[PDB]
Amino acid sequence: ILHYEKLSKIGLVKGVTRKYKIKSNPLTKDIVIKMIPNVSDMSQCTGSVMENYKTRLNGILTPIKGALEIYKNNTHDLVGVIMAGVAIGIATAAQITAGVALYEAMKNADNINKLKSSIESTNEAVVKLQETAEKTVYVLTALQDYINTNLVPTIDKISCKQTELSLDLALSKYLSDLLFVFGPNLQDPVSNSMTIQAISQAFGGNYETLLRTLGYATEDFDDLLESDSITGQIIYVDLSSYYIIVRVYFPILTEIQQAYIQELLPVSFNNDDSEWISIVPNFILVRNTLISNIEIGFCLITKRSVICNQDYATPMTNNMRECLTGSTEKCPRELVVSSHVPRFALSNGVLFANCISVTCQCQTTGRAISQSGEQTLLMIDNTTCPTAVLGNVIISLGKYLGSVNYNSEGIAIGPPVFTDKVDISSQISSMNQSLQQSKDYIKEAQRLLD
Amino acid sequence: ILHYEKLSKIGLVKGVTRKYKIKSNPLTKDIVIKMIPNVSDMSQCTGSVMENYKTRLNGILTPIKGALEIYKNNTHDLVGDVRLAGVIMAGVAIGIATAAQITAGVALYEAMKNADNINKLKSSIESTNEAVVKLQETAEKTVYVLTALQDYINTNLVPTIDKISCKQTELSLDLALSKYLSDLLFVFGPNLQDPVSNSMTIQAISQAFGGNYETLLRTLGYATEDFDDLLESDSITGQIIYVDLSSYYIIVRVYFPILTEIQQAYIQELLPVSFNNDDSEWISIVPNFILVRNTLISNIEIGFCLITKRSVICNQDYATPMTNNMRECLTGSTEKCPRELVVSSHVPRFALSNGVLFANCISVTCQCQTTGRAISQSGEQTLLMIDNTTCPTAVLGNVIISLGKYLGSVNYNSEGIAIGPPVFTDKVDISSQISSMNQSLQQSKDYIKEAQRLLD
Amino acid sequence: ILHYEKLSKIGLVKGVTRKYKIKSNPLTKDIVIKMIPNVSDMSQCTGSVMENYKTRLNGILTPIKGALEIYKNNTHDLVGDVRLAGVIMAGVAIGIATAAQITAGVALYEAMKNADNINKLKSSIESTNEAVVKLQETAEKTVYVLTALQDYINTNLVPTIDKISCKQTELSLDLALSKYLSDLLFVFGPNLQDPVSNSMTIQAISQAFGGNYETLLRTLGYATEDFDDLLESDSITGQIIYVDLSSYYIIVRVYFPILTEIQQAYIQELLPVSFNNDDSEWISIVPNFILVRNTLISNIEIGFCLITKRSVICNQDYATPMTNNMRECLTGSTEKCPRELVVSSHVPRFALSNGVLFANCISVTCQCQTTGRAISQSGEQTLLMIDNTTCPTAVLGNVIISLGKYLGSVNYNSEGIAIGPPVFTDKVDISSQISSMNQSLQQSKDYIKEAQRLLD
Ligand SMILES: *[C@@H]1O[C@H](CO)[C@@H](O[C@@H]2O[C@H](CO)[C@@H](O[C@@H]3O[C@H](CO[C@H]4O[C@H](CO)[C@@H](O)[C@H](O)[C@@H]4O)[C@@H](O)[C@H](O)[C@@H]3O[C@H]3O[C@H](CO)[C@@H](O)[C@H](O)[C@@H]3O)[C@H](O)[C@H]2NC(C)=O)[C@H](O)[C@H]1NC(C)=O
Ligand SMILES: *[C@@H]1O[C@H](CO)[C@@H](O[C@@H]2O[C@H](CO)[C@@H](O[C@H]3O[C@H](CO[C@H]4O[C@H](CO)[C@@H](O)[C@H](O)[C@@H]4O)[C@@H](O)[C@H](O)[C@@H]3O[C@H]3O[C@H](CO)[C@@H](O)[C@H](O)[C@@H]3O)[C@H](O)[C@H]2NC(C)=O)[C@H](O)[C@H]1NC(C)=O
Ligand SMILES: *[C@@H]1O[C@H](CO)[C@@H](O[C@@H]2O[C@H](CO)[C@@H](O[C@H]3O[C@H](CO[C@H]4O[C@H](CO)[C@@H](O)[C@H](O)[C@@H]4O)[C@@H](O)[C@H](O[C@H]4O[C@H](CO)[C@@H](O)[C@H](O)[C@@H]4O)[C@@H]3O)[C@H](O)[C@H]2NC(C)=O)[C@H](O)[C@H]1NC(C)=O
Ligand SMILES: *[C@@H]1O[C@H](CO)[C@@H](O[C@@H]2O[C@H](CO)[C@@H](O[C@H]3O[C@H](CO)[C@@H](O)[C@H](O)[C@@H]3O)[C@H](O)[C@H]2NC(C)=O)[C@H](O)[C@H]1NC(C)=O
Ligand SMILES: *[C@@H]1O[C@H](CO)[C@@H](O[C@@H]2O[C@H](CO)[C@@H](O[C@H]3O[C@H](CO)[C@@H](O)[C@H](O)[C@@H]3O)[C@H](O)[C@H]2NC(C)=O)[C@H](O)[C@H]1NC(C)=O
Ligand SMILES: *[C@@H]1O[C@H](CO)[C@@H](O[C@@H]2O[C@H](CO)[C@@H](O[C@H]3O[C@H](CO)[C@@H](O)[C@H](O)[C@@H]3O)[C@H](O)[C@H]2NC(C)=O)[C@H](O)[C@H]1NC(C)=O
Ligand SMILES: *[C@@H]1O[C@H](CO)[C@@H](O[C@@H]2O[C@H](CO)[C@@H](O)[C@H](O)[C@H]2NC(C)=O)[C@H](O)[C@H]1NC(C)=O
Ligand SMILES: *[C@@H]1O[C@H](CO)[C@@H](O[C@@H]2O[C@H](CO)[C@@H](O)[C@H](O)[C@H]2NC(C)=O)[C@H](O)[C@H]1NC(C)=O
Ligand SMILES: *[C@@H]1O[C@H](CO)[C@@H](O[C@@H]2O[C@H](CO)[C@@H](O)[C@H](O)[C@H]2NC(C)=O)[C@H](O)[C@H]1NC(C)=O
């Protein structure tokens, strides 16, 4: 519901329109990640290594287990669950909801813990524990692929002091990478907004294996990964055996009805005698008839739609909304002073270019396309020129579908502005200066007059 | 010293209060990192590999050694002054230097002493053939030497010296070296313009050792508790002391500092909660973290710090000034607290502050589980304060929590509050609003100008 | 053409002046990256692994191949012109394209020609069984083929084909493939929406080869000059030319540009130094880097560039406009230079500019050692200019540098300067101030509206 014609005349060519999809209705699945390799195969070339490593790991795992109990000790079941408000004291909206979620996981948590001994037994990278009825809980073990493929197969090929040294390194390195995610950085383990790729650091970042193991598969398996929607949550932490139980949340991508995200392609336009760029949102969210900004930064942009892990719409100035609809004089523009800046764009077979700053010649008519000084852009199409040559490219145009006098129409330009961070402080200060002075002329004249 | 009651009424619920700790009084310790694996065990399946690699490495190491000499050649002991001891920097020589850069150079000179002491074992360093090696240095004062890609040469290339071939044992060694350089370049490449300074994270430096900063530290002895909190808060820095372009190893001085909590200072956190006012949801635009020292309220770039449950740990003071109005708003002048329109499905609807609930029961459905009733919110209210007295155990959607007793005005929900002005924070709009405002301002200056000229 | 003297008096000490270099005139070279290891050496301990992996990879590769055809199917030669000779894009067909995207397509077409030339050795590519392998393009011309996870299959899976088992030799191969995909997605995942453009860093593309961009480049041949500076400045880009969904390899065209320092232009850096004015410390809020071309002073987003000691290297012009007032301030109108209150312990207190010192001796102990006289700063003073004239060798705190002779007004310290207005830059405060200002503005437009109606 934007006025694309006027907008294009100030360098905002109409681009691709995408759908707006958001994650929802997750479906949990639980798996275990043992963060201590099984070295029973080389119990001789161990040394203090395994002992110290256990102390180190218990160090970084303890705060996490603790933070989880602070919630397990305040959730009792009686006729759903009920959180102990006074006990919890201070909690954020989401943090509590994550705790409620933790309690239900608990049920299936203890059920898993039953195979505690069976978990330690694991001696392979990926292991399935179905020693029970239908309870087949998966167990990924860290640095296991190493212990098996490389340390064991050369148990004698090297030595026992070396088979020990190399195992210490692989453990120290794993901790070095593991720390980034589970260090003191993981202040709130209660919440469940942690990306699955982040959690997979406990398994060497092989989040591919971690998800396929669990058996997920969807035509959006990747769009969900990149849009950071496949989150995970720590359910339990065993400080004895050194393994954790994470609950992977796998959602669906559903598209918000009556809503699209229109993209505008910026194109340098000429006005006074300098190049200019309109300072207007490059992406616009429209729902029904409501135009709003969107922090598309935190989303995944594909060719057909914008996928976000949550609604990211934000308010928009009133003037900015008017500008986008027809009030072009309310559209800011900043001076262009760089060699590199978009000079033209192709919107639906038609060209929109600032010839005053690019070589526009008509390959068909052999002639060259000229731009008046009074013209901001040019609209090179089928009619004017069947096969134009903007700069080094040669493209064949189509027929423009708007006002047939676009190039002799004209448009009211907006006010110029500067967006440099330093200058925004300068301008705010500069403006207040003038404002204080004019409030003194209005104050001295008001007191002298009446 | 903030007015938490009024603040909560506009969606800024009182959260956790943390201490303000900063790093200080570092204690140095030096170690050597050899960036060339010892391949004497397979000197036959080498080939040009080791030769080219040396050329490549000498390439990226040279600028660093250079930048260090630019300071070693301008620091002489200030011998002769019986009333001042130390080093003296050649100002005219150095030319242009920043405050800190010089201080880092002065620091470099002091390491030169123990630097040369270490260099004495130059031959002993090249000898290293293990990942981590202890080169007994003086009486009890030892020096350690970490060697890059060594664990590979030993565990994987040697143990299959014949299992594969000699052309392959060569190819695989070239790759491991090229990859190491690929990761090493992000830190010691053209990027490392100023090697004089000592503000480089230890994890960054450890890239020379495959990023195994854990081993690099354990091997040095981290006799501390705040060890992890010091790591994450980027306080354990390192500094290049010496660069040997022959043997290809560098001497880094690790600074292990210690935390210390600033006296009489805390960092109060506010939990944002969407509040209803006109007929739209709103969010107050006020700092989410506030630094208070004595009675001074100031902003803090808590971004660059580590936030734990009990305190905010920073690698340096990060306090910054605060508008005057913003300080007033935080204390009671709520009409001076901006607010921006909410237009997103997801945004905090309620928060729990000291057993009590604060919710927008206009944009969320709040019911009282015990009585069954619906805890509804008036139109001229911003939030609600659901506590013992109102609802003993409420239901905010998929949650059921048991409340406690609010300790403030018992008429919080019938009190009311003066709302602030609305604003838009989108970057693009801040330019629009600055431009828009100046428009109006130029026009009103002309009405004041044309009416001032016409009147007197 | 800046007024460095006045600028220094408000804490903007003159720093190093660097050249302004930009990339240009690239020279292409093509190589192939096979993203499927050759496992013919262990065809028995395979299992479904290789099959599934092929399905997975075909998944993430398909969209890329597709996006490339959307351009190959709309570019035909321009047969029929005496003057002009080249390619012609099907505008109506392409529909919506960005300036650069088309130019990248035109570039793709001219690659394709040599692309097919390479594809001729399709079978020869699959044959590859080594990390890096060299092929025969046209006798004199050659093309290279890097194979993913090959070094693993050879050095570690084969050499222990029996040392372990066949179920394990299979498990370990599955992991190495899954992990490779895990890292490969960051760059070739849905992230890679537009494969037509050629602005993708070479290090990014090298993810297909385990991020060993060193080998990918070394094995490709690179010019000695400004090479690392070209890597770090993100100028060595790459572009996907072809995608083979059968054999699973891609042909990338690496662009090697040459830096070209744009004439009549330098980037002056200013060193910030806390200055004293009222009774508080202050910092001038002015660009720390300034781009000057001829006589035009403009801002520059030096963030996206590589800063070396000698020059600023950027992958494209990054100049941006500058307020008018800000330009004046930088030249002499110091009352037009904003300043923000300093409230942090750590903040630069002095800087060395051309052998001369510039310090806030009110907050840092300054004394001249070559005379024993304690160097003192008055209340009315913003900074101090400690040089040869007054002190041959001074001592700030515990630092000791020997100064040189200042070359400007010999009464710099008794000169004085008009201070600018104070401001607050906290993002939260900028919203508060914009709101605050508009408040006042609406009120003054009502006094001008009520007075104007009452008066005439
Ligand atoms: C305050 O600082 C100023 C400079 O910031 C001090 O003056 C300088 O002091 C230094 C060392 O005390 C002098 O060293 C000299 O360096 C020049 C090189 O300069 C070039 O440019 C000059 C421009 O005026 C030319 O005149 C020169 O011809 C030259 O091309 C040498 O040429 C000089 O001889 C001199 O000494 C060097 O040469 C001797 C020769 O035997 C060698 O032993 C060393 O190589 C010496 O380094 C410098 O000349 C001088 N510059 C001036 C005065 O402009 C000043 O002393 C400081 N105040 C005090 C008194 O402390
Ligand atoms: C000016 O520019 C425009 C756009 O760049 C050009 O005309 C428009 O585009 C085409 C011109 O060919 C036209 O579409 C009509 O032709 C289509 C193609 O038919 C052929 O399809 C196969 C070819 O590969 C093959 O089966 C066979 O050869 C077949 O004839 C058909 O889909 C259909 O006939 C199209 O016309 C109908 O559709 C339009 C659009 O919905 C509608 O108006 C009518 O229903 C119409 O009958 C477009 O319609 C053209 N647009 C218009 C209105 O002009 C044109 O080439 C340029 N002018 C010149 C001569 O330079
Ligand atoms: C808020 O509004 C303010 C006013 O609208 C903005 O400040 C104004 O900035 C403009 C520049 O865009 C200034 O205009 C010109 O200033 C000098 C001096 O010329 C002027 O002298 C008198 C002013 O007292 C008057 O006779 C005229 O205003 C006259 O223009 C000139 O050097 C420039 O113009 C020259 O150069 C340009 C090329 O760039 C040519 O096109 C022109 O023909 C001319 O040769 C400036 O444009 C203006 O002085 C200043 N304030 C005034 C008096 O209007 C302020 O920037 C804005 N804030 C923002 C950015 O949001
Ligand atoms: C730091 O001080 C060093 C002094 O110990 C200095 O090293 C020497 O630098 C000069 C460069 O001028 C080199 O000299 C070269 O050129 C002369 C020509 O007169 C030849 O006679 C020499 O053979 C040589 O090729 C010296 O080789 C070099 N000596 C050392 C110590 O290696 C550094 O350059 C100083 N660093 C800086 C940046 O000033
Ligand atoms: C509303 O809930 C309140 C709890 O948040 C409750 O008051 C508090 O009740 C606890 C016990 O549930 C008291 O704790 C202990 O200490 C006191 C003082 O020594 C003892 O008398 C208690 O028996 C108990 O062991 C808290 O001290 C108490 N808070 C205070 C100081 O009042 C309210 O009573 C509930 N409101 C009503 C009346 O329903
Ligand atoms: C500076 O303050 C001005 C008023 O104090 C403001 O202008 C007025 O802005 C309000 C909305 O903020 C507009 O009123 C609209 O209010 C709601 C919007 O949700 C609806 O009921 C209607 O759409 C209603 O129009 C006024 O129209 C507008 N007044 C006018 C014509 O100027 C400025 O926009 C403020 N500018 C800054 C710098 O913030
Ligand atoms: C969890 O709640 C229990 C309530 O029963 C608290 O009691 C602890 O119980 C454990 C049982 O192993 C003991 O080891 C502790 O000594 C008990 N603590 C106290 C203060 O008596 C316990 O505080 C809570 N656990 C947490 C979060 O630490
Ligand atoms: C606009 O200018 C006024 C001055 O006329 C600023 O208000 C002063 O701010 C300082 C520091 O915060 C106080 O010490 C003065 O007492 C204030 N004067 C008063 C009461 O008006 C105001 O902060 C400026 N605002 C902007 C946009 O920077
Ligand atoms: C590009 O042009 C071709 C040529 O007509 C289109 O045709 C398909 O090409 C694939 C190979 O890429 C064949 O296997 C199919 O059988 C062809 N089917 C058709 C005629 O649609 C191809 O689809 C075009 N690519 C696109 C869609 O841009």
PDB file of N, CA and C in Angstrom, chain B residues 263-309:
ATOM      1  N   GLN B 263      34.011  -0.012  46.244  1.00  0.00           N
ATOM      2  CA  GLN B 263      33.294   0.288  47.474  1.00  0.00           C
ATOM      3  C   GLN B 263      32.041   1.096  47.188  1.00  0.00           C
ATOM      4  N   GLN B 264      31.014   0.897  48.006  1.00  0.00           N
ATOM      5  CA  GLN B 264      29.756   1.627  47.854  1.00  0.00           C
ATOM      6  C   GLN B 264      29.287   1.874  46.410  1.00  0.00           C
ATOM      7  N   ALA B 265      29.090   0.791  45.669  1.00  0.00           N
ATOM      8  CA  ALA B 265      28.617   0.863  44.294  1.00  0.00           C
ATOM      9  C   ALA B 265      27.931  -0.434  43.899  1.00  0.00           C
ATOM     10  N   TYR B 266      26.759  -0.307  43.286  1.00  0.00           N
ATOM     11  CA  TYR B 266      26.001  -1.465  42.847  1.00  0.00           C
ATOM     12  C   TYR B 266      25.424  -1.195  41.464  1.00  0.00           C
ATOM     13  N   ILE B 267      25.028  -2.257  40.766  1.00  0.00           N
ATOM     14  CA  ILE B 267      24.434  -2.112  39.448  1.00  0.00           C
ATOM     15  C   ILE B 267      23.041  -2.715  39.485  1.00  0.00           C
ATOM     16  N   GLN B 268      22.052  -1.836  39.582  1.00  0.00           N
ATOM     17  CA  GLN B 268      20.663  -2.235  39.649  1.00  0.00           C
ATOM     18  C   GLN B 268      20.165  -2.542  38.263  1.00  0.00           C
ATOM     19  N   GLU B 269      19.442  -3.647  38.124  1.00  0.00           N
ATOM     20  CA  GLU B 269      18.882  -4.014  36.827  1.00  0.00           C
ATOM     21  C   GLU B 269      17.384  -3.798  36.867  1.00  0.00           C
ATOM     22  N   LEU B 270      16.820  -3.317  35.769  1.00  0.00           N
ATOM     23  CA  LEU B 270      15.384  -3.129  35.706  1.00  0.00           C
ATOM     24  C   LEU B 270      14.855  -4.154  34.683  1.00  0.00           C
ATOM     25  N   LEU B 271      13.714  -4.771  34.997  1.00  0.00           N
ATOM     26  CA  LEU B 271      13.100  -5.758  34.116  1.00  0.00           C
ATOM     27  C   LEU B 271      11.998  -5.051  33.362  1.00  0.00           C
ATOM     28  N   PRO B 272      12.115  -4.962  32.032  1.00  0.00           N
ATOM     29  CA  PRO B 272      11.093  -4.281  31.246  1.00  0.00           C
ATOM     30  C   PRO B 272       9.810  -5.069  31.168  1.00  0.00           C
ATOM     31  N   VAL B 273       8.688  -4.359  31.241  1.00  0.00           N
ATOM     32  CA  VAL B 273       7.367  -4.971  31.158  1.00  0.00           C
ATOM     33  C   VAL B 273       6.428  -4.062  30.402  1.00  0.00           C
ATOM     34  N   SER B 274       5.863  -4.568  29.314  1.00  0.00           N
ATOM     35  CA  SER B 274       4.938  -3.815  28.480  1.00  0.00           C
ATOM     36  C   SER B 274       3.812  -3.253  29.315  1.00  0.00           C
ATOM     37  N   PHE B 275       3.573  -1.951  29.232  1.00  0.00           N
ATOM     38  CA  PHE B 275       2.489  -1.365  30.005  1.00  0.00           C
ATOM     39  C   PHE B 275       1.465  -0.709  29.111  1.00  0.00           C
ATOM     40  N   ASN B 276       0.211  -0.730  29.540  1.00  0.00           N
ATOM     41  CA  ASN B 276      -0.861  -0.150  28.746  1.00  0.00           C
ATOM     42  C   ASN B 276      -1.213   1.253  29.164  1.00  0.00           C
ATOM     43  N   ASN B 277      -1.368   2.129  28.182  1.00  0.00           N
ATOM     44  CA  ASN B 277      -1.753   3.485  28.488  1.00  0.00           C
ATOM     45  C   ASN B 277      -2.892   4.146  27.776  1.00  0.00           C
ATOM     46  N   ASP B 278      -2.788   4.249  26.460  1.00  0.00           N
ATOM     47  CA  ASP B 278      -3.841   4.914  25.727  1.00  0.00           C
ATOM     48  C   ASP B 278      -4.711   3.716  25.407  1.00  0.00           C
ATOM     49  N   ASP B 279      -4.317   2.985  24.377  1.00  0.00           N
ATOM     50  CA  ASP B 279      -5.046   1.805  23.955  1.00  0.00           C
ATOM     51  C   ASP B 279      -4.081   0.938  23.224  1.00  0.00           C
ATOM     52  N   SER B 280      -2.820   1.278  23.435  1.00  0.00           N
ATOM     53  CA  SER B 280      -1.722   0.578  22.823  1.00  0.00           C
ATOM     54  C   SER B 280      -0.785   0.162  23.947  1.00  0.00           C
ATOM     55  N   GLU B 281       0.064  -0.822  23.670  1.00  0.00           N
ATOM     56  CA  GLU B 281       1.030  -1.284  24.649  1.00  0.00           C
ATOM     57  C   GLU B 281       2.208  -0.339  24.537  1.00  0.00           C
ATOM     58  N   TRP B 282       2.975  -0.206  25.609  1.00  0.00           N
ATOM     59  CA  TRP B 282       4.142   0.669  25.596  1.00  0.00           C
ATOM     60  C   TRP B 282       5.328   0.097  26.375  1.00  0.00           C
ATOM     61  N   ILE B 283       6.508   0.623  26.102  1.00  0.00           N
ATOM     62  CA  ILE B 283       7.687   0.192  26.807  1.00  0.00           C
ATOM     63  C   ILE B 283       8.469   1.436  27.124  1.00  0.00           C
ATOM     64  N   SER B 284       8.832   1.598  28.388  1.00  0.00           N
ATOM     65  CA  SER B 284       9.596   2.760  28.791  1.00  0.00           C
ATOM     66  C   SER B 284      10.998   2.624  28.237  1.00  0.00           C
ATOM     67  N   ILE B 285      11.525   3.707  27.681  1.00  0.00           N
ATOM     68  CA  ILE B 285      12.874   3.707  27.150  1.00  0.00           C
ATOM     69  C   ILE B 285      13.805   4.301  28.202  1.00  0.00           C
ATOM     70  N   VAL B 286      14.248   3.446  29.119  1.00  0.00           N
ATOM     71  CA  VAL B 286      15.121   3.841  30.204  1.00  0.00           C
ATOM     72  C   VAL B 286      16.190   2.781  30.382  1.00  0.00           C
ATOM     73  N   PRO B 287      17.384   3.175  30.828  1.00  0.00           N
ATOM     74  CA  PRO B 287      18.443   2.190  31.012  1.00  0.00           C
ATOM     75  C   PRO B 287      17.991   0.939  31.753  1.00  0.00           C
ATOM     76  N   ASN B 288      18.379  -0.230  31.246  1.00  0.00           N
ATOM     77  CA  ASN B 288      18.027  -1.492  31.887  1.00  0.00           C
ATOM     78  C   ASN B 288      18.986  -1.850  33.006  1.00  0.00           C
ATOM     79  N   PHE B 289      20.126  -1.169  33.040  1.00  0.00           N
ATOM     80  CA  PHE B 289      21.133  -1.377  34.063  1.00  0.00           C
ATOM     81  C   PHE B 289      21.572  -0.007  34.502  1.00  0.00           C
ATOM     82  N   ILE B 290      21.658   0.193  35.808  1.00  0.00           N
ATOM     83  CA  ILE B 290      22.068   1.481  36.326  1.00  0.00           C
ATOM     84  C   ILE B 290      23.188   1.322  37.335  1.00  0.00           C
ATOM     85  N   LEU B 291      24.197   2.169  37.209  1.00  0.00           N
ATOM     86  CA  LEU B 291      25.337   2.130  38.101  1.00  0.00           C
ATOM     87  C   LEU B 291      25.179   3.208  39.158  1.00  0.00           C
ATOM     88  N   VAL B 292      25.208   2.812  40.421  1.00  0.00           N
ATOM     89  CA  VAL B 292      25.088   3.783  41.483  1.00  0.00           C
ATOM     90  C   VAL B 292      26.302   3.668  42.371  1.00  0.00           C
ATOM     91  N   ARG B 293      26.993   4.793  42.549  1.00  0.00           N
ATOM     92  CA  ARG B 293      28.174   4.884  43.408  1.00  0.00           C
ATOM     93  C   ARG B 293      27.906   6.008  44.400  1.00  0.00           C
ATOM     94  N   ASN B 294      27.639   5.614  45.646  1.00  0.00           N
ATOM     95  CA  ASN B 294      27.335   6.556  46.717  1.00  0.00           C
ATOM     96  C   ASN B 294      25.944   7.097  46.442  1.00  0.00           C
ATOM     97  N   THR B 295      25.889   8.207  45.726  1.00  0.00           N
ATOM     98  CA  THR B 295      24.607   8.796  45.404  1.00  0.00           C
ATOM     99  C   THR B 295      24.622   9.253  43.965  1.00  0.00           C
ATOM    100  N   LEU B 296      25.646   8.833  43.235  1.00  0.00           N
ATOM    101  CA  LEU B 296      25.741   9.212  41.846  1.00  0.00           C
ATOM    102  C   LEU B 296      25.193   8.138  40.912  1.00  0.00           C
ATOM    103  N   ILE B 297      24.164   8.515  40.164  1.00  0.00           N
ATOM    104  CA  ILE B 297      23.538   7.617  39.219  1.00  0.00           C
ATOM    105  C   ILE B 297      24.134   7.889  37.860  1.00  0.00           C
ATOM    106  N   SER B 298      24.666   6.846  37.236  1.00  0.00           N
ATOM    107  CA  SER B 298      25.288   6.980  35.927  1.00  0.00           C
ATOM    108  C   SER B 298      25.035   5.756  35.071  1.00  0.00           C
ATOM    109  N   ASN B 299      25.120   5.937  33.762  1.00  0.00           N
ATOM    110  CA  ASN B 299      24.925   4.845  32.824  1.00  0.00           C
ATOM    111  C   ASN B 299      26.166   3.971  32.860  1.00  0.00           C
ATOM    112  N   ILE B 300      26.097   2.792  32.253  1.00  0.00           N
ATOM    113  CA  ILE B 300      27.251   1.905  32.205  1.00  0.00           C
ATOM    114  C   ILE B 300      27.157   1.042  30.969  1.00  0.00           C
ATOM    115  N   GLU B 301      28.254   0.938  30.233  1.00  0.00           N
ATOM    116  CA  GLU B 301      28.267   0.135  29.023  1.00  0.00           C
ATOM    117  C   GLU B 301      28.465  -1.308  29.393  1.00  0.00           C
ATOM    118  N   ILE B 302      27.521  -1.807  30.176  1.00  0.00           N
ATOM    119  CA  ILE B 302      27.535  -3.170  30.667  1.00  0.00           C
ATOM    120  C   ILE B 302      27.687  -4.182  29.544  1.00  0.00           C
ATOM    121  N   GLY B 303      27.684  -3.711  28.308  1.00  0.00           N
ATOM    122  CA  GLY B 303      27.845  -4.631  27.204  1.00  0.00           C
ATOM    123  C   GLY B 303      29.200  -5.304  27.277  1.00  0.00           C
ATOM    124  N   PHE B 304      30.234  -4.502  27.496  1.00  0.00           N
ATOM    125  CA  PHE B 304      31.600  -5.005  27.565  1.00  0.00           C
ATOM    126  C   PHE B 304      31.967  -5.689  28.865  1.00  0.00           C
ATOM    127  N   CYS B 305      30.981  -6.071  29.660  1.00  0.00           N
ATOM    128  CA  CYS B 305      31.303  -6.741  30.908  1.00  0.00           C
ATOM    129  C   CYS B 305      30.687  -8.120  30.959  1.00  0.00           C
ATOM    130  N   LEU B 306      30.995  -8.833  32.035  1.00  0.00           N
ATOM    131  CA  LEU B 306      30.466 -10.164  32.244  1.00  0.00           C
ATOM    132  C   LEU B 306      29.434 -10.050  33.327  1.00  0.00           C
ATOM    133  N   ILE B 307      28.216 -10.496  33.055  1.00  0.00           N
ATOM    134  CA  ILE B 307      27.188 -10.418  34.073  1.00  0.00           C
ATOM    135  C   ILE B 307      26.900 -11.782  34.663  1.00  0.00           C
ATOM    136  N   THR B 308      27.141 -11.919  35.959  1.00  0.00           N
ATOM    137  CA  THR B 308      26.879 -13.172  36.644  1.00  0.00           C
ATOM    138  C   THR B 308      25.662 -12.907  37.516  1.00  0.00           C
ATOM    139  N   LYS B 309      25.194 -13.912  38.241  1.00  0.00           N
ATOM    140  CA  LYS B 309      24.021 -13.696  39.062  1.00  0.00           C
ATOM    141  C   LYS B 309      24.283 -12.754  40.235  1.00  0.00           C
TER     142      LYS B 309
END
